[PDB]
Amino acid sequence: QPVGINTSTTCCYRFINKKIPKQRLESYRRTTSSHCPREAVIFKTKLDKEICADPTQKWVQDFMKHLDKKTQTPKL
Numbered sequence: 001q002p003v004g005i006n007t008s009t010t011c012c013y014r015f016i017n018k019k020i021p022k023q024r025l026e027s028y029r030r031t032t033s034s035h036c037p038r039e040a041v042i043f044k045t046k047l048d049k050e051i052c053a054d055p056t057q058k059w060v061q062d063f064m065k066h067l068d069k070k071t072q073t074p075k076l
Contacts, residue, residue, distance in 0.1 A: 011036040012052040020053060020063060021045075027067050028060075043067075 011031050020043060028043040029050070040052045041060055053060045 011038065012040055012042070013038065014052050015054040016051060017054065020051070020060070022063065022066070024049075025063055025067055028064060 009029075009031075024045045024047075025043055026046055028041055030042065031038075031040050033039050039055055041055050041064070042050045042052050043060075043063070044050055055061075
C-alpha cells in the first residue's frame with residue numbers, strides 16, 4: 001500500500017505496425033476507454049508476454065476472432 005502505485009494494470013502508447021505471431025497468439029486483453037485516453041488491444045502470449053497493437057486495421061480484429069475460439073455456450 002504505497003502513496004499511489006497500485007497493484008493493477010495501465011495503458012501503453014506503443015504502436016507496433018509489424019506482423020504478430022499467430023502461433024504464439026492465444027488471447028488478448030483490451031484497455032478501458034473511460035480510464036485510458038487511447039484505446040489499444042493487448043495480445044497475451046503463452047509466455048506471459050503482453051504486446052499492445054494499434055487498433056485500426058482488421059488483421060488484429062481478425063486475430064481476436066480466431067483467438068476467442070470458445071465464446072457462446074450452445075446449451076439446449
